[PDB]
């Protein structure tokens, strides 16, 4: 199982998230207290990349979802066999990949051949004019309660950086609870942190 510990590197790689509201039917939201992104199926998850230095050209950004619980680490975070057969493809993703990326022509998808898991790769672009971050619009294709896939188990999404050879430059991790109600499921897990 690949590691989930936060790797800053010499590059100052940090994940930025939009400060979105906690409405009942939000499309994507992030909790700073639990480092937990709550979002929907097949919807836009803009994840900002805040860097202290500009990386050399050819650098790429790999996303990978792993289970947070240790008793389920042997299972690959995969789609349920119902959603594996639905016609929800964007024309670039195999139907078993949980993570997807829209708004980019150069996305890679990987079934890694040792660890048997799903990896989602985009090439990193520098921040635009006026910008301090490059936003990757992520898409998750299953909820966490899908039977045969995640199955009510909370998952951690690992965002990694690498150059074209594949050596690791930086890694940040954040928890993911995908359900139909993202903003409300942040609220019952903020009720989880305040005792009594």
């Amino acid at each position: 199982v690949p590691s989930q510990k936060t790797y800053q590197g010499s590059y100052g790689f940090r994940l930025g998230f939009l400060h979105s509201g906690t409405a009942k039917s939000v499309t994507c939201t992030y909790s700073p207290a639990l480092n937990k992104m709550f979002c929907q199926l097949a919807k836009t998850c803009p994840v900002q990349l805040w860097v202290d230095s500009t990386p050399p050209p050819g650098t790429r950004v790999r996303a990978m979802a792993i289970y947070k619980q240790s008793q389920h680490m042997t299972e690959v975070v995969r789609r349920c066999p119902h959603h594996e057969r639905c016609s929800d493809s964007d024309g670039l993703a195999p139907p078993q990949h949980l993570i997807r990326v829209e708004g980019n022509l150069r996305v890679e998808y990987l079934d890694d051949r040792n660890t048997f898991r799903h990896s989602v790769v985009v090439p990193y672009e520098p921040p635009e004019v006026g910008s301090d971050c490059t936003t990757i619009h992520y898409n998750y294709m299953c909820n966490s309660s899908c039977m045969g896939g995640m199955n009510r188990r909370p998952i951690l999404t690992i965002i990694t950086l690498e150059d074209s050879s594949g050596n690791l430059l930086g890694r940040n991790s954040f928890e993911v609870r995908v359900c139909a109600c993202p903003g409300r499921d942040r609220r019952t897990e903020e009720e989880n942190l305040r005792k009594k």
């Binding site: 936060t6 940090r14 906690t22 207290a33 991790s173 928890e175 903020e190 942190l193 305040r194 009594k196």
Partner: protein, 117 residues
């Protein structure tokens, strides 16, 4: 120079009102009919301080200039300044640990808070 204001609207604005929020005495008692005097056997049952204290909501405190935020904690402290001085004793509620310096909802899970000097 000039425009030496003979002070009208400094700190003596909170002191003077007396009819601005504390008059908010309705459901009147017009010609009362339902009445039965009885023996005093049933106990008091004062309500609590759990509900007089207000559990903190998450999406609030955006508009809310912090002259109102620090005064809101001073509402659940000056209503609390009776019940640990004179009267029936309640416990300390759960929300009182944030009545702190930064914020109520500070991150403690998920460490590596950006190594720096």
């Amino acid at each position: 120079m000039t425009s030496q204001s003979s002070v009208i609207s400094n700190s003596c604005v909170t002191m003077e009102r007396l009819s601005h929020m504390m008059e908010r005495a309705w459901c009147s008692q017009e010609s009362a009919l339902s009445e039965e005097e009885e023996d005093t056997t049933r106990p008091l049952e004062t309500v609590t301080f759990k509900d007089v204290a207000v559990d903190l909501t998450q999406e609030e405190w955006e508009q809310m200039k912090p002259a109102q935020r620090n005064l809101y904690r001073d509402v659940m402290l000056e209503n609390y300044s009776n019940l640990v001085t004179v009267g029936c004793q309640v416990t300390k509620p759960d929300v009182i640990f944030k009545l702190q310096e930064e914020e109520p909802w500070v991150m403690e899970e998920e460490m590596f808070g950006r190594h720096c000097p």
